[PDB]
């Protein structure tokens with residue numbers, strides 16, 4: 001049995017930590033909502 | 040139940056201790072998460088109940104108490120923030136430039152950030168604090184890392 005707990009406001013924060021790259025990927029989406037890499 | 044706008048953890052007691060299975064967004068009295076988090080099950084908020092209203096396994100989205108409310112979109116240019124709510128850790132904003140998922144039905148923004156599966160449903164924000172989609176559905180690359188779509192639903 002599942003329940004929810006509040007964790008915060010939804011707000012842009014100036015000088016967050018900045019990270020991650022920006023990959024361009026060919027992908028396919030199947031009927032079960034699973035993405036896969038096309039090559 | 041608690042109906043204040045904001046980000047919420049999704050918990051179960053059906054395993055060892057209390058386990059965080061994912062995250063979601065309360066906006067305009069509607070609770071928004073990913074389908075793979077709840078599998079469409081009911082939720083508790085205090086002694087209040089949240090019943091599913093809309094869902095789609097293919098979009099991997101579900102709404103509670105009413106229709107999907109989040110309609111903002113990635114501009115295709117600007118840096119965004121994942122409001123990550125990891126299991127047992129405080130909400131933390133992480134700012135990133137989304138890559139692109141290229142699909143036969145069109146391009147989708149994507150964010151390349153590693154977080155445990157229980158973070159599924161954390162919202163992705165634009166510079167104005169608008170939810171442009173959820174984090175948790177995508178693809179595992181060579182790195183063993185995860186790249187998530189920016190999943191968004193339609194507002195009617």
Ligand SMILES: Cc1cnccc1NC(=O)c1cccc(-c2nccs2)c1
Nearest residue numbers: 075153154155156159175176183184185
């Ligand atoms: C469970 C499920 C079912 N169906 C669709 C998607 C998913 N989602 C994941 O599997 C998932 C979500 C966030 C992150 C990660 C990883 N982080 C790093 C390594 S894999 C996986």
